[PDB]
């Protein structure tokens, strides 16, 4: 049981573990595209004696954080331990080695999507975005008098084939990801993969269609089994006008009973309708998880709310350092100190605060965040909050 | 078809309409208790020719708003139109008369719980609290190392019969309702009714039990049909310690698979567990709806966030007046003006902002709130936000 | 194993067999009411050695047949064989004795509601009415421009308590039953029983309400478990205006999603709506079964369609006689003959034709009815058809 | 937004709208076959500016009406409005243009299958056939002593592969469609398509088998997911003997629990069994919809019941003309008149009466058909009734 960077000859063994560990695994062909995002020493495997019994890697990503700042991000992925080798310290050993490499390589943050919610907290990852499924019973849906784009004349939205308008989706997404916390750069190879999933599969998913606006798009397909349900896989809108116009078109899918989408808690859709209740929350879950690798770099890199007045405090991260944190004029300065801590929290908690999805006050109430000053709590809440609601880009 | 205040002889007809309109109607005996909260001219009926074909009333309530300010509140309730008399203007006529009476009587706000979400917006009511059902699979639930009250020694929580500890529930609730936005005074007659519902009914609900802490309680019963589900009807906790200790006791209901509760979006429960995902959101809906009757009085009465610096603007409510709004040092001044509006919104939108459940930014994105200044938007968001998360007291 | 008329001392044993044989059995108290409809020698029991192991009886009923003719009808009921004594000839023996008594007493027809559809054909009973369940999704239901009673002014329908308007229901039902084939006289004791079932039961059925028009009524209650479903137990309407007005009121039950009713195949409800499809047929089944006891008397007693021109034929009923049947001017003459048969059928088939629910042509296609002349077939179809659609009165 | 006949270059855009509008759409290959039934100017499209945002067409069909008369019929089909262009008058505009073309081309009737039941009434289409799903629990099914084809010797029914007996199916269907109201000529290209659907699809429908009699056939396949359910896609039988023999063979599918078929309300199947109840009606819906284009031509073309004696009346169709209607000896004469109307109805109502699926009396009770003479009503009922029960041929 030794731990190594994989060679080319290890990858058939890694794909076998992948097929056995991940039910949603698309085979080796699609893996080629994703592999191009893995840097030279971005992967570790565990061999027994040899067969691959453990693997983990990270991908080079670009993540937007509040203030429209783009951080280099290590995207943990393809993590698997063979069912033959559970409870053997393998996950801990692989995660430790990758975090060492990630830290040394100079990434300020790491990120992942969690298969289970009970695993990654102990390795310093905190849930940082919230997925929110809305299901609209579109048969009752009427738009409010106040909703944009309800005037006479032609529609600005076109119904199109995804593969024939790649350039427009790319450009709209690029604009979206740069202005929204949680945004990820989507490289060319992932557009290739996305548009491949758009066509129908024999005994699989139905054909995808697109609704295209100059400042937004929606990709949707009819569900495999529920033929009265349309699933919006992705809706990206840069303006409120685009968002409303796309939803006017989706509600116009008259052969459907229900439209579902995985969105974020601050999606304005409910408020566009005369009956807000028709946009039912059918599902909620953690989206992106963040591990802050370098506390000073991460805290100094993001923007903070201009509304809160300048304040200073001392933050201790458990086994992560202690810092003099000064926030004012939407910027933070974060420097070493041995002064008494005013705020303590584990590393995972900081990840949860970092994009503004969770309030300091809420985490304080669970005692995941410890302070004796409730004024400081309010100031943290306000400072770390995000002007632009945090969203989830794409799963990896 | 005339509109009158009911006499004693109208009430049998009103109870008949009630039994036919409300499936959850407890009969005339329980109605006696609720009736004591209806003031002298708090009710209207419509007769044909005579039989009661329409009714509506309000109750005298006390509602806590941000800054722990308690407002006299007209609680609209018992609203019904006979199925024989739909689409006849009756709801509009009854609501107009009651709003006249409520306004003239000097209530700054009216409030209701909505049977449907598409009805009450046009009468100036906006959803102001959010109900959030969490279902915990308690078989997997483990408390985080950081969670309070996990030390050795005895428990501070007692398992008791509700009817034998009325005084303690009353006193704990009184403390709770005064410090939480959305809190309602629960008068003696509603405690009588609550503790009557606590006992088992033949072929109905099972017996209720209570978990009692010095600074919190939980009332729960096993579900009628799903005998592995415990439903928490009510949990009131004044400290984080009480909240955690009550949840340690609920997770200790070892004969149950699942514990469900209707709570609020900022309930810290998920953060008390090592796996936040185990607290699944199974249901979300509008709670209390508010109609601001008097804009200046309401806006001046509540507290605002101290974090945001002093600012001035001009607010227009559609057919509700235009006001110079000045907010600073957590207080607002709201005075008449004919200066150009910087913010416009319908009356219902203001109700939705008033307890801090919805962000101005979110409503702006749906164009329910119109301004040309995005800095002003951020300032409104921050100012109207509530330090203490808004919760829902009891349905009426 | 002997067969006797029961004495008073046999009835506790009969109630025991009843409770064990019929899940819907209301106990001995309600049985008192039904017992008053059983004539002196209207019942048979089988004892072993003694305990009651078999029973059957008939009740004195009055049944409306086409031409608004009311026949004395033997209503077979309370038929049961102990589970200890199956496959022992007991049903055959009891049915033979009762049919002897019924014939000798001078009833032209016997009738029953069948627990199973495979039992009663061999004893000469044919299904003669069709039950048709319609479920309306009332949220989408809009009335057609052509539908009666859509004008301004007050409603003619009142929402009332059943027990306070007994006289009006009685009188409306009396008018209904006399003008509709399948109508049964409902005696006073069955009104007592019907209005007793109208009140709520602890852990049972919910309270019943009534919609009352001068020329019709509907009795309905919310379903026990599906609280968005209203079940119409009974709707009796003497005019099209009443029928439409009652349905306008039922569609006005705004707290319900669905209204269901057990009606007949020619219920005009679907045609009152702009979307006929909203009245979905969710269930179909045989209603009343008829055994023609005396062929000549039965065939001469009913009216026939005036449209078909006079014709003569020879009808043979298998082991039931052969007859010269002459039909003209809406009347039949039916006399003995030994002339060659032009039409043959079993006795059960004639029962199925008798109220016009089934077409001769349809039964001919199954070869349940044999003739070599297709012109005769068309003439039978037309002659036996009912001007007024056949309906089902009440179960017994 | 202009309205044109499509060119060859419009058809890729039409197929895109089709794939997005119709979930059951087989792609462009199968569309080639259906296209051959569309005449030169049988189609309209709406372009914006260009992309296809609206389309509609008709196909040249031959429809059998009572009296075995075959009418040229315009089969409306492939109707779709883009979800981006709802509530824009497009359906109304396309339907108006096609009806103009259909009328001018000399079709007496148009016909369609309705995606929803609330759409096509306002354009003068009335539901004219009823689909009736029967589900037989074949484990209990026993044939009645009277049922044909229960004697000793060999079976007349063969189990075969559909594709190897095309000629026999074609010839049997041709005989069927010519003698049954609702029958449609099935051209060669639709036989090609039907037999292509008969083979198994990977992750789709299972292989179809055929039961073949000299005077009937049944096509059936095991359901995708319910492997104890056999679905009869099509059963065509020219004699009662064939119908019974095919059902004896279907009940002999001993590996199945249930056989389902979409048939018509007068299917004799229930009467072939000792227990009629085993043939449960699981589903009912409108089949073919008719719009009478030319009232005189349509009414003069069909045969009427010989049983009713000669009578004369005056029929007014709303915005469709007024006519002296004389019916006798199974033929109608229909000529212009300005004499006072004795019968009024909308155009859609006449379509519903035309094949005898709905009774005049029933439509009168809903006030869709207005007369003051109830004798006239009875005469219409009898006259328009169909000797041969109306059935549904194939969907288009
Ligand atoms: C399949 C992994 N899955 C289960 C935990 C996680 C969620 N992933 C997705 O939703 C997009 S599909 C995908 N994603 C990759 N990161 C990858 C990688 C591949 S294939 C591939 N496919 C090869 C090496 C780089 C990572
Ligand atoms: C039954 C009304 N229901 C349906 C819309 C609304 C929700 N109400 C509850 O969840 C508590 S039960 C209750 N509530 C009342 N306000 C009242 C009133 C009564 S009984 C009564 N019971 C008589 C007059 C004052 C209001
Ligand atoms: C209970 C019998 N049931 C099961 C086969 C048949 C259907 N009957 C009903 O839907 C009305 S309840 C009823 N009906 C009776 N005929 C009777 C009789 C009684 S109780 C009674 N209750 C005593 C003797 C006369 C018949
Ligand atoms: C797909 C249309 N569908 C949805 C409303 C209606 C029902 N149609 C069927 O059940 C047989 S499949 C079919 N039918 C056509 N008429 C057509 C036509 C095609 S493909 C085709 N396929 C191209 C032009 C002529 C009509």
mmCIF file of N, CA and C in Angstrom, chain C residues 170-264:
data_model
loop_
_atom_site.group_PDB
_atom_site.id
_atom_site.type_symbol
_atom_site.label_atom_id
_atom_site.label_comp_id
_atom_site.label_asym_id
_atom_site.label_seq_id
_atom_site.Cartn_x
_atom_site.Cartn_y
_atom_site.Cartn_z
ATOM 1 N N UNK C 170 -86.975 15.033 0.021
ATOM 2 C CA UNK C 170 -87.985 13.984 -0.163
ATOM 3 C C UNK C 170 -88.829 14.278 -1.406
ATOM 4 N N UNK C 171 -89.358 15.503 -1.485
ATOM 5 C CA UNK C 171 -90.275 15.890 -2.550
ATOM 6 C C UNK C 171 -89.546 15.924 -3.900
ATOM 7 N N UNK C 172 -88.302 16.419 -3.916
ATOM 8 C CA UNK C 172 -87.520 16.485 -5.159
ATOM 9 C C UNK C 172 -87.221 15.055 -5.635
ATOM 10 N N UNK C 173 -86.834 14.176 -4.700
ATOM 11 C CA UNK C 173 -86.493 12.786 -5.024
ATOM 12 C C UNK C 173 -87.727 12.057 -5.573
ATOM 13 N N UNK C 174 -88.882 12.267 -4.929
ATOM 14 C CA UNK C 174 -90.152 11.644 -5.327
ATOM 15 C C UNK C 174 -90.435 11.976 -6.801
ATOM 16 N N UNK C 175 -90.303 13.255 -7.174
ATOM 17 C CA UNK C 175 -90.498 13.695 -8.562
ATOM 18 C C UNK C 175 -89.492 12.994 -9.488
ATOM 19 N N UNK C 176 -88.222 12.947 -9.064
ATOM 20 C CA UNK C 176 -87.141 12.354 -9.852
ATOM 21 C C UNK C 176 -87.423 10.873 -10.140
ATOM 22 N N UNK C 177 -87.738 10.105 -9.089
ATOM 23 C CA UNK C 177 -87.804 8.638 -9.185
ATOM 24 C C UNK C 177 -88.976 8.213 -10.087
ATOM 25 N N UNK C 178 -90.031 9.034 -10.135
ATOM 26 C CA UNK C 178 -91.235 8.731 -10.911
ATOM 27 C C UNK C 178 -91.023 8.975 -12.409
ATOM 28 N N UNK C 179 -90.040 9.798 -12.791
ATOM 29 C CA UNK C 179 -89.910 10.162 -14.201
ATOM 30 C C UNK C 179 -88.662 9.524 -14.834
ATOM 31 N N UNK C 180 -87.867 8.768 -14.066
ATOM 32 C CA UNK C 180 -86.583 8.244 -14.568
ATOM 33 C C UNK C 180 -86.574 6.718 -14.470
ATOM 34 N N UNK C 181 -86.343 5.972 -15.576
ATOM 35 C CA UNK C 181 -86.144 4.525 -15.483
ATOM 36 C C UNK C 181 -84.955 4.176 -14.571
ATOM 37 N N UNK C 182 -85.170 3.210 -13.673
ATOM 38 C CA UNK C 182 -84.231 2.876 -12.617
ATOM 39 C C UNK C 182 -84.582 3.530 -11.289
ATOM 40 N N UNK C 183 -85.513 4.493 -11.291
ATOM 41 C CA UNK C 183 -85.963 5.142 -10.050
ATOM 42 C C UNK C 183 -86.588 4.143 -9.084
ATOM 43 N N UNK C 184 -86.292 4.307 -7.790
ATOM 44 C CA UNK C 184 -86.896 3.526 -6.711
ATOM 45 C C UNK C 184 -87.565 4.476 -5.715
ATOM 46 N N UNK C 185 -88.775 4.120 -5.274
ATOM 47 C CA UNK C 185 -89.392 4.751 -4.121
ATOM 48 C C UNK C 185 -88.411 4.607 -2.949
ATOM 49 N N UNK C 186 -88.098 5.724 -2.289
ATOM 50 C CA UNK C 186 -87.306 5.706 -1.065
ATOM 51 C C UNK C 186 -88.251 5.910 0.114
ATOM 52 N N UNK C 187 -88.580 4.854 0.894
ATOM 53 C CA UNK C 187 -89.494 4.996 2.027
ATOM 54 C C UNK C 187 -88.879 5.823 3.164
ATOM 55 N N UNK C 188 -89.718 6.175 4.140
ATOM 56 C CA UNK C 188 -89.360 7.097 5.210
ATOM 57 C C UNK C 188 -88.147 6.572 5.987
ATOM 58 N N UNK C 189 -88.135 5.272 6.297
ATOM 59 C CA UNK C 189 -87.073 4.679 7.123
ATOM 60 C C UNK C 189 -85.703 4.808 6.438
ATOM 61 N N UNK C 190 -85.660 4.859 5.102
ATOM 62 C CA UNK C 190 -84.371 4.983 4.389
ATOM 63 C C UNK C 190 -83.912 6.451 4.345
ATOM 64 N N UNK C 191 -84.861 7.400 4.364
ATOM 65 C CA UNK C 191 -84.538 8.821 4.580
ATOM 66 C C UNK C 191 -83.946 9.028 5.981
ATOM 67 N N UNK C 192 -84.525 8.365 6.993
ATOM 68 C CA UNK C 192 -83.993 8.410 8.367
ATOM 69 C C UNK C 192 -82.519 7.985 8.344
ATOM 70 N N UNK C 193 -82.247 6.871 7.656
ATOM 71 C CA UNK C 193 -80.922 6.283 7.607
ATOM 72 C C UNK C 193 -79.970 7.191 6.818
ATOM 73 N N UNK C 194 -80.434 7.728 5.681
ATOM 74 C CA UNK C 194 -79.601 8.583 4.829
ATOM 75 C C UNK C 194 -79.150 9.830 5.606
ATOM 76 N N UNK C 195 -80.068 10.446 6.357
ATOM 77 C CA UNK C 195 -79.771 11.691 7.070
ATOM 78 C C UNK C 195 -78.940 11.419 8.330
ATOM 79 N N UNK C 196 -78.957 10.176 8.823
ATOM 80 C CA UNK C 196 -78.094 9.769 9.937
ATOM 81 C C UNK C 196 -76.636 9.658 9.463
ATOM 82 N N UNK C 197 -76.431 9.161 8.238
ATOM 83 C CA UNK C 197 -75.094 9.041 7.624
ATOM 84 C C UNK C 197 -74.519 10.418 7.249
ATOM 85 N N UNK C 198 -75.355 11.466 7.284
ATOM 86 C CA UNK C 198 -74.990 12.816 6.832
ATOM 87 C C UNK C 198 -74.091 13.530 7.853
ATOM 88 N N UNK C 199 -74.200 13.169 9.139
ATOM 89 C CA UNK C 199 -73.389 13.801 10.194
ATOM 90 C C UNK C 199 -72.014 13.120 10.261
ATOM 91 N N UNK C 200 -71.047 13.840 10.841
ATOM 92 C CA UNK C 200 -69.670 13.370 10.984
ATOM 93 C C UNK C 200 -69.614 12.218 11.997
ATOM 94 N N UNK C 201 -68.672 11.295 11.772
ATOM 95 C CA UNK C 201 -68.402 10.169 12.665
ATOM 96 C C UNK C 201 -66.980 10.291 13.209
ATOM 97 N N UNK C 202 -66.753 10.110 14.534
ATOM 98 C CA UNK C 202 -65.401 10.192 15.094
ATOM 99 C C UNK C 202 -64.476 9.129 14.477
ATOM 100 N N UNK C 203 -63.462 9.591 13.733
ATOM 101 C CA UNK C 203 -62.515 8.729 13.014
ATOM 102 C C UNK C 203 -63.150 8.034 11.817
ATOM 103 N N UNK C 204 -64.215 8.640 11.277
ATOM 104 C CA UNK C 204 -64.969 8.107 10.147
ATOM 105 C C UNK C 204 -65.187 9.167 9.081
ATOM 106 N N UNK C 205 -66.388 9.168 8.491
ATOM 107 C CA UNK C 205 -66.757 10.096 7.427
ATOM 108 C C UNK C 205 -66.909 11.509 8.008
ATOM 109 N N UNK C 206 -66.637 12.507 7.160
ATOM 110 C CA UNK C 206 -66.784 13.917 7.495
ATOM 111 C C UNK C 206 -68.256 14.308 7.321
ATOM 112 N N UNK C 207 -68.616 15.484 7.840
ATOM 113 C CA UNK C 207 -69.972 16.018 7.748
ATOM 114 C C UNK C 207 -70.363 16.178 6.272
ATOM 115 N N UNK C 208 -71.631 15.881 5.973
ATOM 116 C CA UNK C 208 -72.209 16.100 4.653
ATOM 117 C C UNK C 208 -72.899 17.463 4.616
ATOM 118 N N UNK C 209 -72.802 18.114 3.456
ATOM 119 C CA UNK C 209 -73.512 19.338 3.169
ATOM 120 C C UNK C 209 -74.402 19.107 1.946
ATOM 121 N N UNK C 210 -75.377 19.999 1.776
ATOM 122 C CA UNK C 210 -76.311 19.922 0.688
ATOM 123 C C UNK C 210 -76.323 21.255 -0.058
ATOM 124 N N UNK C 211 -76.436 21.154 -1.385
ATOM 125 C CA UNK C 211 -76.751 22.254 -2.260
ATOM 126 C C UNK C 211 -78.188 22.037 -2.743
ATOM 127 N N UNK C 212 -79.057 23.014 -2.464
ATOM 128 C CA UNK C 212 -80.489 22.872 -2.651
ATOM 129 C C UNK C 212 -80.990 23.927 -3.644
ATOM 130 N N UNK C 213 -81.648 23.430 -4.698
ATOM 131 C CA UNK C 213 -82.358 24.187 -5.726
ATOM 132 C C UNK C 213 -83.832 23.796 -5.641
ATOM 133 N N UNK C 214 -84.800 24.647 -6.057
ATOM 134 C CA UNK C 214 -86.209 24.240 -6.047
ATOM 135 C C UNK C 214 -86.494 22.924 -6.797
ATOM 136 N N UNK C 215 -85.653 22.585 -7.789
ATOM 137 C CA UNK C 215 -85.867 21.432 -8.677
ATOM 138 C C UNK C 215 -84.646 20.497 -8.695
ATOM 139 N N UNK C 216 -83.842 20.515 -7.627
ATOM 140 C CA UNK C 216 -82.732 19.579 -7.503
ATOM 141 C C UNK C 216 -81.940 19.786 -6.225
ATOM 142 N N UNK C 217 -81.172 18.762 -5.846
ATOM 143 C CA UNK C 217 -80.244 18.844 -4.735
ATOM 144 C C UNK C 217 -79.023 17.969 -5.024
ATOM 145 N N UNK C 218 -77.939 18.279 -4.311
ATOM 146 C CA UNK C 218 -76.715 17.502 -4.280
ATOM 147 C C UNK C 218 -76.274 17.355 -2.820
ATOM 148 N N UNK C 219 -75.954 16.120 -2.420
ATOM 149 C CA UNK C 219 -75.348 15.819 -1.128
ATOM 150 C C UNK C 219 -73.882 15.476 -1.368
ATOM 151 N N UNK C 220 -72.986 16.117 -0.620
ATOM 152 C CA UNK C 220 -71.572 15.890 -0.804
ATOM 153 C C UNK C 220 -70.863 15.993 0.549
ATOM 154 N N UNK C 221 -69.674 15.386 0.601
ATOM 155 C CA UNK C 221 -68.777 15.458 1.737
ATOM 156 C C UNK C 221 -67.338 15.394 1.216
ATOM 157 N N UNK C 222 -66.420 16.013 1.961
ATOM 158 C CA UNK C 222 -64.997 15.886 1.698
ATOM 159 C C UNK C 222 -64.579 14.456 2.054
ATOM 160 N N UNK C 223 -63.726 13.869 1.205
ATOM 161 C CA UNK C 223 -63.191 12.515 1.395
ATOM 162 C C UNK C 223 -62.400 12.443 2.711
ATOM 163 N N UNK C 224 -62.437 11.269 3.356
ATOM 164 C CA UNK C 224 -61.751 10.991 4.630
ATOM 165 C C UNK C 224 -60.271 11.386 4.571
ATOM 166 N N UNK C 225 -59.572 10.893 3.542
ATOM 167 C CA UNK C 225 -58.104 10.920 3.487
ATOM 168 C C UNK C 225 -57.610 11.935 2.444
ATOM 169 N N UNK C 226 -58.231 11.963 1.253
ATOM 170 C CA UNK C 226 -57.906 12.966 0.215
ATOM 171 C C UNK C 226 -58.740 14.231 0.471
ATOM 172 N N UNK C 227 -58.117 15.224 1.116
ATOM 173 C CA UNK C 227 -58.813 16.423 1.604
ATOM 174 C C UNK C 227 -58.986 17.467 0.490
ATOM 175 N N UNK C 228 -58.540 17.146 -0.730
ATOM 176 C CA UNK C 228 -58.753 17.992 -1.903
ATOM 177 C C UNK C 228 -59.815 17.364 -2.821
ATOM 178 N N UNK C 229 -60.450 16.276 -2.365
ATOM 179 C CA UNK C 229 -61.502 15.586 -3.118
ATOM 180 C C UNK C 229 -62.846 15.724 -2.390
ATOM 181 N N UNK C 230 -63.847 16.236 -3.113
ATOM 182 C CA UNK C 230 -65.243 16.240 -2.661
ATOM 183 C C UNK C 230 -65.998 15.120 -3.384
ATOM 184 N N UNK C 231 -66.695 14.282 -2.613
ATOM 185 C CA UNK C 231 -67.494 13.193 -3.157
ATOM 186 C C UNK C 231 -68.974 13.577 -3.100
ATOM 187 N N UNK C 232 -69.606 13.627 -4.275
ATOM 188 C CA UNK C 232 -71.039 13.811 -4.386
ATOM 189 C C UNK C 232 -71.683 12.435 -4.218
ATOM 190 N N UNK C 233 -72.349 12.214 -3.082
ATOM 191 C CA UNK C 233 -72.967 10.916 -2.802
ATOM 192 C C UNK C 233 -74.243 10.755 -3.639
ATOM 193 N N UNK C 234 -74.880 11.881 -3.985
ATOM 194 C CA UNK C 234 -76.206 11.882 -4.579
ATOM 195 C C UNK C 234 -76.531 13.262 -5.154
ATOM 196 N N UNK C 235 -76.908 13.288 -6.435
ATOM 197 C CA UNK C 235 -77.404 14.475 -7.100
ATOM 198 C C UNK C 235 -78.667 14.095 -7.872
ATOM 199 N N UNK C 236 -79.784 14.713 -7.485
ATOM 200 C CA UNK C 236 -81.076 14.506 -8.097
ATOM 201 C C UNK C 236 -81.585 15.859 -8.601
ATOM 202 N N UNK C 237 -81.874 15.910 -9.902
ATOM 203 C CA UNK C 237 -82.261 17.108 -10.607
ATOM 204 C C UNK C 237 -83.372 16.740 -11.594
ATOM 205 N N UNK C 238 -84.451 17.528 -11.556
ATOM 206 C CA UNK C 238 -85.666 17.289 -12.325
ATOM 207 C C UNK C 238 -85.651 18.136 -13.611
ATOM 208 N N UNK C 239 -84.840 19.203 -13.647
ATOM 209 C CA UNK C 239 -84.704 20.074 -14.823
ATOM 210 C C UNK C 239 -83.221 20.235 -15.170
ATOM 211 N N UNK C 240 -82.947 20.600 -16.427
ATOM 212 C CA UNK C 240 -81.590 20.884 -16.894
ATOM 213 C C UNK C 240 -81.022 22.110 -16.164
ATOM 214 N N UNK C 241 -81.892 23.088 -15.885
ATOM 215 C CA UNK C 241 -81.514 24.307 -15.171
ATOM 216 C C UNK C 241 -80.962 23.938 -13.789
ATOM 217 N N UNK C 242 -81.685 23.081 -13.055
ATOM 218 C CA UNK C 242 -81.279 22.626 -11.716
ATOM 219 C C UNK C 242 -79.926 21.903 -11.787
ATOM 220 N N UNK C 243 -79.785 21.001 -12.762
ATOM 221 C CA UNK C 243 -78.569 20.206 -12.950
ATOM 222 C C UNK C 243 -77.365 21.132 -13.152
ATOM 223 N N UNK C 244 -77.508 22.125 -14.038
ATOM 224 C CA UNK C 244 -76.428 23.073 -14.328
ATOM 225 C C UNK C 244 -76.117 23.930 -13.094
ATOM 226 N N UNK C 245 -77.158 24.440 -12.430
ATOM 227 C CA UNK C 245 -76.977 25.345 -11.289
ATOM 228 C C UNK C 245 -76.258 24.613 -10.151
ATOM 229 N N UNK C 246 -76.626 23.351 -9.909
ATOM 230 C CA UNK C 246 -75.966 22.556 -8.872
ATOM 231 C C UNK C 246 -74.484 22.361 -9.226
ATOM 232 N N UNK C 247 -74.180 22.192 -10.518
ATOM 233 C CA UNK C 247 -72.798 21.954 -10.950
ATOM 234 C C UNK C 247 -71.983 23.251 -10.927
ATOM 235 N N UNK C 248 -72.628 24.392 -11.192
ATOM 236 C CA UNK C 248 -71.983 25.697 -10.999
ATOM 237 C C UNK C 248 -71.561 25.850 -9.527
ATOM 238 N N UNK C 249 -72.419 25.424 -8.594
ATOM 239 C CA UNK C 249 -72.118 25.522 -7.157
ATOM 240 C C UNK C 249 -71.004 24.541 -6.761
ATOM 241 N N UNK C 250 -71.006 23.322 -7.321
ATOM 242 C CA UNK C 250 -69.998 22.308 -6.953
ATOM 243 C C UNK C 250 -68.609 22.730 -7.449
ATOM 244 N N UNK C 251 -68.547 23.297 -8.659
ATOM 245 C CA UNK C 251 -67.304 23.819 -9.246
ATOM 246 C C UNK C 251 -66.808 25.030 -8.437
ATOM 247 N N UNK C 252 -67.716 25.697 -7.715
ATOM 248 C CA UNK C 252 -67.371 26.803 -6.817
ATOM 249 C C UNK C 252 -66.829 26.364 -5.459
ATOM 250 N N UNK C 253 -66.580 25.066 -5.250
ATOM 251 C CA UNK C 253 -65.921 24.607 -4.017
ATOM 252 C C UNK C 253 -64.410 24.809 -4.167
ATOM 253 N N UNK C 254 -63.971 26.048 -3.917
ATOM 254 C CA UNK C 254 -62.659 26.544 -4.335
ATOM 255 C C UNK C 254 -61.529 25.902 -3.513
ATOM 256 N N UNK C 255 -61.837 25.338 -2.337
ATOM 257 C CA UNK C 255 -60.815 24.645 -1.536
ATOM 258 C C UNK C 255 -60.551 23.218 -2.055
ATOM 259 N N UNK C 256 -61.353 22.725 -3.013
ATOM 260 C CA UNK C 256 -61.166 21.371 -3.582
ATOM 261 C C UNK C 256 -60.421 21.453 -4.920
ATOM 262 N N UNK C 257 -59.658 20.400 -5.231
ATOM 263 C CA UNK C 257 -59.042 20.202 -6.540
ATOM 264 C C UNK C 257 -59.995 19.428 -7.459
ATOM 265 N N UNK C 258 -60.665 18.419 -6.891
ATOM 266 C CA UNK C 258 -61.440 17.450 -7.650
ATOM 267 C C UNK C 258 -62.820 17.242 -7.008
ATOM 268 N N UNK C 259 -63.834 17.132 -7.878
ATOM 269 C CA UNK C 259 -65.193 16.700 -7.534
ATOM 270 C C UNK C 259 -65.452 15.383 -8.270
ATOM 271 N N UNK C 260 -65.862 14.349 -7.526
ATOM 272 C CA UNK C 260 -66.233 13.062 -8.103
ATOM 273 C C UNK C 260 -67.714 12.779 -7.830
ATOM 274 N N UNK C 261 -68.339 12.050 -8.760
ATOM 275 C CA UNK C 261 -69.715 11.610 -8.630
ATOM 276 C C UNK C 261 -69.885 10.277 -9.365
ATOM 277 N N UNK C 262 -70.702 9.396 -8.779
ATOM 278 C CA UNK C 262 -71.187 8.201 -9.457
ATOM 279 C C UNK C 262 -72.526 8.561 -10.107
ATOM 280 N N UNK C 263 -72.503 8.608 -11.439
ATOM 281 C CA UNK C 263 -73.614 9.055 -12.254
ATOM 282 C C UNK C 263 -73.907 7.968 -13.301
ATOM 283 N N UNK C 264 -74.469 8.372 -14.445
ATOM 284 C CA UNK C 264 -74.832 7.466 -15.541
ATOM 285 C C UNK C 264 -74.131 7.910 -16.825
#
